[PDB]
Design a protein around this ligand. Structure first.
Ligand SMILES: N[C@@H](CC(=O)O)C(=O)O
Ligand SMILES: N[C@@H](CC(=O)O)C(=O)O
Ligand SMILES: N[C@@H](CC(=O)O)C(=O)O
Ligand SMILES: N[C@@H](CC(=O)O)C(=O)O
Ligand SMILES: N[C@@H](CC(=O)O)C(=O)O
Ligand SMILES: N[C@@H](CC(=O)O)C(=O)O
Ligand SMILES: N[C@@H](CC(=O)O)C(=O)O
Ligand SMILES: N[C@@H](CC(=O)O)C(=O)O
Ligand SMILES: [Mg+2]
Ligand SMILES: [Mg+2]
Ligand SMILES: [Mg+2]
Ligand SMILES: [Mg+2]
Ligand SMILES: [Mg+2]
Ligand SMILES: [Mg+2]
Lengths: 252, 252
């Protein structure tokens, strides 16, 4: 499987997940239907989305690490799948949620070859491959902002900060892309619990890097050894290479 | 002018604002075109929205307090107009922004008779009159949550807090409605600078009250005396009666 196969497969998945979600009424979608393998409830919305995605992915030689159903399959290509990221938004009719896919040539993030985030509410398509990062077919890149007085997405502000603005939308996959295209100057999940799972962030990180962003853990260590398994957890500091170290110092 | 007149006029305005905005490309929309009478730049998108709204409002015996153009007209009915609230979002293709209108029989919020917020990106319609609060025709009401461990919209988190989730979408008009319909358990703008302007909050406050929410200033004081002028500024604590005082204690 190569980066063109991946785009083809992801698009097909985005299409089916969109169909499934849309043909579900809010009152039915918000319902708890079971316990995710991740340890959090699976909403009906999560279930229908994962089903449509898994239906397509089983026809491939891959191992899938997906939020509601855990690890599936045997292949050597590894796929981190968030079938529905921003489920809380989705169930409230709030239009920020996406299906997220990252593909890797091993169970570690450093071997990622394709990242893909499709906003299921707006239809915006983000992906990145060896050629670069795209929003709706157009090349994107991170902003040139050098100042801490900038536009930040941050989980969670636990003190007074210097940012121009702070936002929290409730979907890291999509929010990493907001950073990837330059809409926001930086992205930060600095929650002490390390809440981010591999499928939440893998795609977005990959896209943001292709878009020129520097993306690390809290101390600035590489994300390269982050594993595609249910146990993996992440803190993230993303910014252009000039803003990035200023952020590291700010949270020290 | 009564509460049915206001509904008719607000809907007409929403339709025209959506038309005006949608007919503009992001690259043209995002441009600074002037200085608002509020003291912040007016984007192209802000200007075209305001123009559409003012064409319809100039034909009524009203005084309009609007963000980009300031105070206008001489009528005894006062209208707080945010022609585009969430402009930052709108210019970035982020689908959380609205046009906001509160109508009052005096220049003080205590005499408000109609509240209206129309999401320009999703078409959701929120309003409230003497009969209650509506989302897209359907009656709404705030959540019953009693615990601080709840779903919060808060500007801005500046210390560790007890909430289940924190969200910041960048449009208080819409976010006040998210609270009004129970999607979030509370809404807080506690910024030291007291940043909210009358047209940012008036409608949303009105709708949220009709929905059962208790909505006050920082110290629990009434909002009734808040004036429909450019000088007015607000901090907000909104919740159901049970949750509200717990929040007041939390932020002391
Ligand atoms: N983004 C796809 C459509 C989809 O994935 O739904 C395309 O451009 O064809
Ligand atoms: N991840 C939760 C929110 C949170 O706990 O940050 C959600 O479903 O949105
Ligand atoms: N998924 C959320 C929904 C809610 O808070 O009402 C939870 O139960 O934590
Ligand atoms: N990463 C989790 C937590 C959050 O964003 O609140 C999610 O995307 O929902
Ligand atoms: N919400 C209006 C339509 C609009 O204002 O655009 C209606 O119910 O017809
Ligand atoms: N009102 C600003 C955001 C903020 O200062 O919170 C904007 O949306 O442009
Ligand atoms: N309206 C914002 C836009 C931005 O921050 O890029 C500003 O005041 O500059
Ligand atoms: N633009 C956002 C935030 C702010 O301006 O304070 C609002 O007014 O709702
Ligand atoms: Mg789950
Ligand atoms: Mg998910
Ligand atoms: Mg997730
Ligand atoms: Mg302005
Ligand atoms: Mg505005
Ligand atoms: Mg506003």
């Amino acid at each position: 499987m190569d980066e063109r196969d991946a785009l083809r497969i992801s698009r097909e998945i985005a299409g089916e997940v969109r169909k499934a979600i849309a043909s579900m009424p809010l009152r039915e979608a918000v319902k708890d239907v079971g316990m995710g393998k991740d340890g959090t409830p699976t909403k009906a919305a999560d279930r229908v989305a994962e089903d449509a995605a898994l239906e397509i992915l089983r026809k491939e030689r891959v191992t899938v690490v997906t939020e509601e159903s855990g690890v599936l399959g045997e292949g050597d290509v590894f796929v981190a799948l968030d079938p529905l990221d921003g489920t809380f938004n989705a169930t409230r009719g709030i239009p920020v949620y996406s299906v997220s896919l990252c593909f890797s040539y091993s169970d570690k993030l450093k071997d990622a070859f394709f990242g893909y985030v499709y906003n299921l509410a707006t239809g915006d398509e983000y992906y990145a491959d060896s050629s670069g990062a795209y929003r709706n077919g157009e090349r994107i890149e991170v902003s040139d902002a050098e100042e801490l007085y900038c536009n930040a997405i941050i989980y969670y502000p636990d003190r007074k900060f210097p940012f121009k603005r702070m936002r929290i939308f409730g979907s890291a996959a999509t929010e990493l892309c907001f950073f990837a295209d330059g809409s926001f100057d930086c992205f930060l999940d600095i929650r002490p619990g390390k809440m981010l799972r591999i499928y939440d962030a893998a795609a977005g990180v990959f896209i943001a890097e292709k878009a020129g962003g520097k993306v690390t853990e809290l101390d600035g260590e590489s994300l390269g050894n982050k594993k595609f398994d249910m146990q993996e957890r992440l803190n993230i500091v993303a910014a252009n290479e000039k803003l990035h170290p200023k952020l590291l110092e700010l949270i020290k």
